[PDB]
Assembly symmetry: C5
Homo-oligomer: 311 residues x 5
């Protein structure tokens, strides 16, 4: 079968729609998400047109093999989508109404700069390649774009599912391609990160600062070195949940900065002990008393600077 013939030099408009049924498996490391949705397609085929009086029927149901169907693909997928045709209905003016239910693993990059207080715009790119007989252009039927109420994405708040109505028409290998952009706006549920990573990480840091109220070098060494090892464990835990980024993330910046605080606390603990052994505890006492104020003040100000730079 060949595509429908053009009245004038006009291209063939294929009206599209995506209705999300299930949304799942958003892999932060892979930058992928899995989708289960309806894909609706509509175009006019004058060759399929019929008399309602003469034929008796108001609409004709065809099997995919019986009629011409546009080769519609997704750009940003891993493998060709798993699809199952639900219905094909032809009106007697030749207006075809196609509906399929599909599942695909969509590849969409994420911006981790503000992690875990980040928001994302996931994309689903629909595409059609023009044939030699005719040029095919995609359009959005807004009445056929949406999502089910029950659609949930573990660890995410689904904000909106909309389509950029104007297609990106371009040439690829000397043929017109009509590309449509479907956008799923999400925002991370940061809640769990507070009692599981942030608050624990702060507690161990504050425990290391108790060395500023101790003259016992052996105890101070144990306090600062032990809490530093727990901080290393939290750093490893965080980086296993995230992919390697060519930029600094918000959590990554805080985690990295806290290492500098542990390093300076080791210097303070060392300086204090050296002075005490040198019979200079009065100078050591001045440094330790200053450290009690300096460490929390510099930590608070550095975090204000970080929060300002990132948000």
């Amino acid at each position: 079968v060949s595509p429908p013939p053009p009245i004038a030099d006009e291209p063939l408009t294929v009206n599209t729609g995506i209705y999300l049924i299930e949304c799942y498996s958003l892999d932060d490391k892979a930058q992928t998400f899995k989708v289960n949705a309806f894909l609706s397609l509509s175009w006019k085929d004058r060759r399929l047109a019929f008399d309602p009086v003469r034929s008796g029927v108001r609409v004709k149901t065809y099997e995919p093999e019986a009629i011409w169907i546009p080769e519609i693909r997704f750009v940003n997928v891993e493998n060709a989508r798993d699809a199952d045709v639900v219905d094909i209905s032809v009106s007697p003016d030749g207006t075809v109404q196609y509906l399929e239910r599909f599942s695909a693993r969509v590849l969409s990059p994420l911006d981790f700069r503000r992690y875990p207080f980040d928001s994302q715009t996931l994309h689903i790119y629909l595409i059609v390649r023009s044939v030699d007989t005719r040029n095919i252009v995609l359009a959005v039927d807004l009445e056929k774009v949406g999502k089910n109420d029950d659609v949930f994405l573990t660890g995410w708040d689904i904000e909106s599912f909309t389509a950029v109505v104007k297609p990106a028409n371009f040439a690829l290998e000397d043929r017109l391609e009509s590309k449509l952009d479907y956008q799923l706006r999400i925002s991370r549920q940061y809640f769990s990160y507070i009692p599981n990573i942030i608050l624990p990480m702060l507690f161990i840091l504050f425990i290391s600062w108790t060395a500023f109220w101790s003259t016992s070098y052996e105890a101070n060494v144990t306090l600062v070195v032990s809490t530093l090892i727990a901080h290393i464990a939290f750093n490893i835990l965080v980086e296993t949940n995230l992919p390697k980024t060519p930029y600094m993330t918000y959590t990554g910046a805080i985690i990295f900065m806290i290492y500098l605080f542990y390093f300076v606390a080791v210097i303070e603990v060392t300086v204090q002990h050296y002075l005490k052994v040198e019979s200079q505890p009065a100078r050591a006492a001045s440094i330790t008393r200053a450290s009690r104020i300096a460490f929390p003040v510099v930590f608070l100000l550095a975090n204000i600077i970080l929060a300002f730079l990132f948000f």
Copy 2:
């Protein structure tokens, strides 16, 4: 083939049933479970009706391609179910009896608030989309709903498998959809959590409290800091078994609260040492003696408050 014609304007009733054969792979993190079951369908097709006297046969067996079969799908699945038709039997009045055996990965959200003393209602949503000729409505044949005795779900007690008999009839993309809710009620086998997570976590906390019977700062620092690191290991272990929730879980609340007890024990150990060095051991002794009662009493009361808020 077209759907059966309506006598009057009445919709076509498709009676359904699900009989669970195997239940497995309940993934807490993914909020998914795998199912292997029978799906029974029954509807009247007057065009298939025959006289038992004339034809000779009491029932006619057809192949799926030979007759009209309703396009029945699951709402909350990852991918279309893997199905294999078992039987299609037509009675003289045109009553069709369809049976298939399928397997599917069902996406059903879980409520982890009371974890690991939680109960869940897993859902399997059956759905049919109306055609242009006729409107299709789903119904439950209660005699065809059930489960095999051998059906087990590792780490769970299967309570019941029932169906909400009245369908959710609604419009989706200007067509009637008839949705049925099948509910599998389960309750977690909490047993293993007691000797593997809860009891060990309490033992290490109680070991940290031995510092209240010691004047040795170096030993106290080792006791409280070492047990805190073991607590961090249990926290990481627990959160690997669970997905990130925008709410606090029961275990998560206990785990988080225990950090505050470690933090205050570090303060006590620090205060006691500072006072001893300041030649004030009488004041330090009063604080340590109070701590011996305060810590277990505040721990017991805070746990009563938590258990009350969660159950």
Copy 3:
């Protein structure tokens, strides 16, 4: 095609056989195992009967589509088996001899009570559903039941592969079902658990007991707390290899009991230090000397009690 017609009211006997070729991927956590085997089927179809003199041939080879073949399924599988027909041979009396090679992931629950000194009976349930024309019953052809010599299951000793010759005939959705039970008896190769988990776990426990020959509280605290952390690591390691059970396993009981020994050792170390500080080292010496005998004796007796209860 319809099933063979009954001479008298007798059911149609389908003789079965399973010959294991490959056995692999026994997942303890999932309670699944993967199998690759031959499935042989034999039944009489009088409609296929022929004269060897007239036809010339001793046996007739048919393609699956050409003749009636019983819809044979496995009960306890994840998905329908991956099968490939090898041969279909018909004898002059109409006796059909079918052979296929299949692969399936079989779901069979395991009893971990005696782990890792446990034995299991894996099951493969063959099933046939009766048709409206005739009732179909399964039988075992013992000459066609067996396994290849090279059949190995990593970490397991394959003991026997037999079939319960009498089928479980029952009604499911108003139709007769004939179920056969194939049993693969296995026993775990416990060897590796001795140098990798048991012996190391005992060594660290015995190291904690050296604190009974030390008066140094700081060293004792280090000894008992450090070895307890290594015991936590072994507990976490063991529970990653096992699923969560609503009962106590043998290894789980030993692991749990050892926590009580660490807890009492901390109490002893604390009591000894408190008494020494109170200027009562004579009383402390009596407790420490008793502990040197009490700890290994109570450990040995408790293990005899455990081994008796579990075996």
Copy 4:
């Protein structure tokens, strides 16, 4: 269908092109990467030639089954590619223009010597096997070789996608094989390794060197042994991200060398304590003062030697 007949003894030239759409899942351990691209093929088939005046059409569109298409395969794949034909267009002279969209998991070895400051040349080998009637040779149509702008590879900078225009023609099982080499040049985004592995690893090493400003053996033992354990954690973390190589990687060399620095620091800490106990602290003081300069100087020089040998 048979291949096109040769005018003279000349082989049949199949012009090829690969246009990358999506690039993903570069597994360092497996030495694999996943690709989604267009594969364009062009060859002359004089039997398909037609007159544009007589036929009316400028180009003829065929289905794959209708005409002869060369059996084109990838050498370095896991499984045969997942392909879907997009278009087949024949020009009046018989010039066939084939286009398919495919996805494949490509097996290409990586050189980890300079890791994580490494660059790679990923290969995609196209191959055709000659038939008995004719010899088939591959060619590159440079106008049909390229990549989409949006093509990203998490943790990598895509440099170029080019083809080695001259094929590797050879004999395999007494038949000519024409192999083409498509090269994707990439360079690793090392950024993240600096705040996550390298800087932390240096901090813990520098903390171990504070023992050179302490006379307390107990504190020194804690400092050097604790930091060594954190170094073991970083070594284990690094080797989980990398496959086992029969050569030394840059990071592997630095990680290994740092063990020698910890080992010598333990010797220094031991020697210092032995001398102090032997009433020789003046000799011990000379060794510790030298160590304060020797350790950072030898570390800096050894790293210059390593960086020189590796880059």
Copy 5:
């Protein structure tokens, strides 16, 4: 189609060949490896014989459906191979030349006794089952057996790919089976194990022996107990890379033996301290001085004994 008829009572010889293209994913734990290769088959079918003068053609190309092809399978696979026919060529005498390209996950057990200095013989078992008309025997065409030069197996040195030319002819379910053994000889690249596991494990052990040059019980306890915990981490790391074996591996023996050295070092450290407290440091000094020689000498000799028993 039926198999070729026998001139005399001779069986039908199917000449075989395997040419490896890609070798990958050797899973030590699963005892599996993935292969991508050519499978060549050749047999004489007198019914397909033709005159080159009369027909005009020197060779006839057939589609698999058109002619009889032997049902060739692999014994030690997980699932049936993924195959794609490349060519089928018939010579005038009826000699058929079949070629397919396949991919399969091969199940072949490994001997870990000498790990990681082990060598393996991977097996690929080809098999044919005789039909009722004729007996089918397999043969090796040595000119069609080989491997590509680029064939690499991450962490392994590919030594040779040969075939045992004489088949194992046997009876399975009253039918002849002709089995061929293809052997891929590999040897592990042990290099990486030296700087990543062996050298680090020795360093921590040697650090524990510094306690023999210290009279400080508290420091000795820290040294021996801390290094023992790092040894536990290396033991856990090693056993995650290996499957559970009913025998002792070389690395497993060394790892286990080192526990005994840590245990005896704890006894030495305990005995030394007990004697010092008992005012017997002269006896303690004799034991510690002996230990300085005994520990490295017994370690070196025990390793010579182990290396002798294993190689």
